[PDB]
Write a protein that binds this ligand. Structure first.
Ligand SMILES: Nc1ncnc2c1ncn2[C@@H]1O[C@H](COP(=O)(O)OP(=O)(O)OP(=O)(O)O)[C@@H](O)[C@H]1O
Length: 328
């Protein structure tokens, strides 16, 4: 019987097996029959279904923009990801134990729902770890010592800020402001400034290539193709990093404010530890050009992007399987 940690992200799902490490990296996507709502495929299998299936099948991210997925969706996705990860040719394989990463502050009712869905999906039993703690373990922070640590996980739908000390979360804030809203800010900006409509792929490409959080000087320029909203015809334009930084500015400073505010609620001595140690960013949204510089300047604090920021949460969920009792 294997032991799994699962990060069912708003954009990316990762499964970690004790002993092996991360074995699965697939988008958090479902293929749904538009009229019956039936989920017909998950993950990569959902991707393999679209364009190849007669019915009105649609690929959707159930947690886009940090929306909480309902019970049935959660249990259907979990069942796919659990089955795919423990796929070994053999016998005498018991139902796995599963650590599920969850948001900070989940109500006891919601937590029971996650556990129930995860057992329903095939787990012998399921446990939870709060995401900022998973993230801090995966970023090699000293979560068990008395010193203050700070982590900021920016994903697709959610940013989570947490000061950690002595094996617990001391102060924490979660906002639905992250990679999806950054993409939407770019789409809206081009829509108002150029009466042009671009899709999510293009907004993502724009954000990765010339997106930036602070001074955009020297980042350059991009040619992008979209649809003219007056004529309906494809149309190509030129956008500057200055424009993109301007489009992102309010999203960035919502994130910066969450960091500042959390620090301002934290016990002063844990803050001074953080000032010495530094803030660690995790999640794919931490890769936004110069976000680490901006947060450092607005807090007068060191800021480091953790190595492999897209895996920290999943690694931390995996290492929690070494001391399961501490999460029961
Ligand atoms: N180079 C980059 N610059 C900016 N954003 C990036 C970059 N690479 C990836 N991202 C963003 O990171 C996000 C995905 O990160 P991640 O997988 O950590 O999110 P998530 O699935 O919501 O995670 P979780 O729910 O576990 O916190 C996407 O919004 C993506 O656009």
């Amino acid at each position: 019987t294997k032991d799994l940690g699962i990060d069912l992200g708003t954009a990316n799902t990762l499964v970690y097996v004790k002993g092996k490490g991360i074995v699965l990296r697939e988008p958090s996507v479902v293929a749904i029959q538009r009229d019956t709502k039936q989920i017909v495929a998950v993950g990569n299998e959902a991707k393999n279904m679209i364009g190849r299936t007669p019915g009105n099948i649609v690929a959707l991210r159930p947690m886009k923009d940090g929306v909480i997925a309902d019970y049935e969706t959660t249990a259907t996705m979990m069942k796919y990801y659990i089955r795919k990860a423990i796929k070994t040719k053999g016998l005498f394989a018991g139902k796995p134990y599963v650590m599920v990463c969850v948001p900070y502050g989940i109500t006891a009712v919601e937590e029971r729902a996650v556990i129930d869905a995860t057992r329903q999906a095939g787990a012998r039993d399921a446990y939870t770890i709060e995401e900022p703690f998973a993230a801090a373990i995966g970023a090699n922070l000293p979560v068990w010592e008395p010193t203050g640590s700070m982590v900021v996980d920016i994903g697709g739908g959610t940013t989570e800020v947490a000061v950690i000390s002595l094996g617990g979360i001391v102060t924490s804030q979660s906002i639905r402001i992250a990679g999806d809203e950054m993409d939407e800010a770019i789409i809206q900006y081009i829509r108002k400034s150029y009466n042009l409509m671009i899709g999510e792929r293009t907004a993502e490409a724009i954000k990765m290539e010339i997106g930036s959080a602070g001074n955009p000087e020297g980042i350059g320029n991009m040619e992008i193709r979209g649809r003219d909203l007056l004529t309906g015809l494809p149309k190509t334009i030129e956008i500057s990093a200055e424009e993109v930084a301007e489009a992102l500015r309010d999203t960035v400073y919502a994130i910066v404010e969450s960091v500042k505010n959390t620090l301002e609620k934290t016990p002063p001595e844990l803050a001074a530890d953080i000032m010495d140690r530094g803030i660690v960013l995790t999640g794919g949204g931490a890769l936004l050009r110069n976000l680490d510089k901006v947060i450092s300047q607005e807090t007068d604090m060191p800021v480091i992007v953790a190595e492999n920021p897209l895996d920290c949460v999943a690694i931390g969920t995996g290492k929690a399987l070494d001391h399961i009792d501490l999460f029961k």
